């Protein structure tokens, strides 16, 4: 495994057959294993694509690795998904696991679907990052921010209190999977694509105000396109 090297104010690859002393490791505190946010590569954040990126495998056991502190994520996820028969799906997090420190918008999902396999796994192999431990597998509950890790040789409440967007899932891990936004105990809006957290956040302009607000014994789903809100377009 190659290490980044900072020298002549640029990155250099450690994997050479001569280690010239121009780079020196005076102490172990020059070492870093910092995590990086996958999102920083411009990777799409639509929740449907997030689902597309997870493998749903059974077979080989999960592993985790310790890593150095790293960059903030705008988007992160919490998951409650269960199998259609009401079986729990995906293991409870192991001791010492807690959600990532700085997500701006943790997305929370619940609902059921086939939830194939037992250990999930990222289709690209990207790490899930929980606090300071990278993982190859998704844990229940707590937030995982997709990312990668690198190793290099070195020469206020809103920072975590922010978080919006909780929604239901219909099916899971398959092409047929669908999501519906939920506010005020109302399931609504298909969330198909192209919606930033703020795009969705502004939809709360309708909550207890400009629309929706099913003041009935049950909740009504609106199909997103008022045209967008799709008020009274529920079926």
């Amino acid at each position, epitope marked *: 495994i190659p290490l980044g090297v900072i020298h002549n104010s640029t990155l250099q690859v450690s994997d050479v057959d001569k280690l010239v002393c121009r780079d020196k490791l005076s102490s172990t505190n020059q070492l870093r294993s910092v995590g990086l946010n996958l999102e920083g590569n411009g990777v799409a954040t639509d929740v449907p694509s997030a689902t597309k990126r997870w493998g749903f495998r059974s077979g080989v056991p999960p592993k985790v690795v310790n890593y150095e502190a790293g960059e903030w994520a705008e988007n992160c996820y919490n998951l409650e998904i269960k199998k259609p028969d*009401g079986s729990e799906c995906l293991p409870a997090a192991p001791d010492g696991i807690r959600g990532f420190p700085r997500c701006r918008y943790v997305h929370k999902v*619940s*609902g059921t679907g086939p939830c194939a396999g037992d250990f999930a796994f990222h289709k690209e192999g990207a790490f899930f990052l929980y606090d300071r431990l990278a993982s190859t597998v998704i844990y229940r509950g707590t937030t995982f921010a997709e990312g990668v890790v690198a190793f290099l040789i070195l020469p206020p409440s809103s920072g975590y209190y922010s978080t919006t967007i909780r929604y239901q899932a219909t099916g899971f891990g398959t092409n047929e999977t669908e999501y519906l936004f939920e506010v005020d*105990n109302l399931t609504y809006v298909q969330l198909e694509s192209r919606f930033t957290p703020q795009f969705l956040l502004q939809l709360n302009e309708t909550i207890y105000t400009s629309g929706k607000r099913s003041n009935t*014994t*049950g*909740k*009504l*789903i609106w199909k997103v396109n008022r045209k967008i809100r799709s008020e009274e377009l*529920s079926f």
Partner: antibody
Amino acid sequence: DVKLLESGGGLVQPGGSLKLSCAASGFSLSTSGVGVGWFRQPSGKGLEWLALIWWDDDKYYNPSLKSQLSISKDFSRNQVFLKISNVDIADTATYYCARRDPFGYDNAMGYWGQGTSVTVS
Amino acid sequence: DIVMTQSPLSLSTSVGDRVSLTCKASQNVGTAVAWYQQKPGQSPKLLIYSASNRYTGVPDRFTGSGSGTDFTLTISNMQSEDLADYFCQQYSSYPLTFGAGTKLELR
């Protein structure tokens, strides 16, 4: 067009317990926001409410009976269930399952079960 | 919990009668109401949706009206096949409530 099917426990002693169930043989119940539920008609009486179940995992009960009533489901088999603690003569009734019919606006339910009945002795 | 009532509690009928029924409640239902029809040996089939739309496949003899706490169901040109126990229901609040029902007998 759903062939909802009634099912349930047999005759029980009063002070007993009851399990009731139904199934939607004509429908997966996988559409989000589907609501199903129960109501009963003792002695030819009107549609007393018992419970509501949502595909989105929401549960409701008639508070007067709620202390002895519980909702359960088994989606893999398109099943819905009730459990009743302390069943007695006041609980003898015809019983029915129900589903939203217009679907997705104002409940609109609506669609009904075949009907079953329960007695005690 | 919310009071629901209906009237007349029973009505004598004859063919071609314009039936008028009403449903009343303590709370302003706001038109989130539905009407139902029932016969012995049968489910309480839907008649009216959202205080207005008869359910699909219901004959157009069945119409209805009102808002808030007041609603009606009427039957144009009643036929003897329409004798039934009739009901109404509240969808604006819960626990769910329904009208006490009414019955008709031709004669």
